[PDB]
Design a protein around this ligand. Sequence first.
Ligand SMILES: [Cl-]
Ligand SMILES: [Cl-]
Lengths: 190, 198
Amino acid sequence: PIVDSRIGAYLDGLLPEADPVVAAMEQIARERNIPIVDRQTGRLLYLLARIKQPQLVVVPGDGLGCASWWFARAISISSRVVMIDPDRDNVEHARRMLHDNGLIDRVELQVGDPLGIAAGQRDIDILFMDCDVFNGADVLERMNRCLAKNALLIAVNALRREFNHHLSRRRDFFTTIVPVGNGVLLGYRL
Amino acid sequence: GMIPIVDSRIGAYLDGLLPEADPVVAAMEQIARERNIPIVDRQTGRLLYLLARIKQPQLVVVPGDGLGCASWWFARAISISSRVVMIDPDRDNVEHARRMLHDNGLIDRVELQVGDPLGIAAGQRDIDILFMDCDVFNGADVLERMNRCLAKNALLIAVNALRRGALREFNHHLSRRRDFFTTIVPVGNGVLLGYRLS
Ligand SMILES: [Cl-]
Ligand SMILES: [Cl-]
């Protein structure tokens, strides 16, 4: 357990009615057995992006375009979410979802190698990452140069390694791991 | 020990990632423990700092602040062109904060006042970050008085949201406010975050 099950149950009870887009995506994930960002985590992503007001958000790997949806909902047309996934299915699901909901205008989607393609970006304001898929150390070796001044690294599934300690021991980042969902590491570039 | 929030094992791990402690902060904890004053724990203060850095506020208002602990975290996160306005009825709180801030020089961007926290806070305008302690104030009441003082897209940060310094009244209220986007992060005693929609 990350947080007491009674606390988690309570926080869920306080939730508003779900967005049918999110409810629909949660069904597809469930059946295709695709892991996706839980709802408390997605809400945090949305909050963070609204506060941060990023111009560029990069998402290397995104099951059903789930993270991309939370981020897209948070930015205006003057900004962009760039999503890359190696599975054409995740990309086509995401595309249809964003198109249908009037957000495709601010989201760039590509089928391919996530970090391979993501590294072509510059001045990234928010870099999203899934610890279940990539090792932070590997990610930063290839992406640190793509980060904007005061960029925010958001790493999900951070609690459930060497990376959590490392990012917490370097002068160029202010890092904290919040116990939301499966743990979310937030690394702010100083 | 009280209402449990983060698993003890997880808590220990997160604490193990904490960097070497600032003696300023360490000096403040003990003083808090001797004057029996509740203060923001380190994981919580670090979250405050991070949120403030990404928010980039011009004005942060802290109505009520034991030993100036909250103001200390916020002061460190803002520019010389910005301000933290701290109000507390106790002269010892205000003086403790003045000293720390004078000592680190950040007194240059912090306004400290001895008085009624809400009475004085209510005179502020275009507040970017409004800090709040759920143990001391009825959130709904604070917001009914202060919403008018908030800047576009202000952020509300309410501590002791899940347990006393789980869950309480302001959580139920704020979650229903269609004018805010809210979430509760279960760090420390729980932290309620409310973003004021455009
Ligand atoms: Cl580049
Ligand atoms: Cl610290």
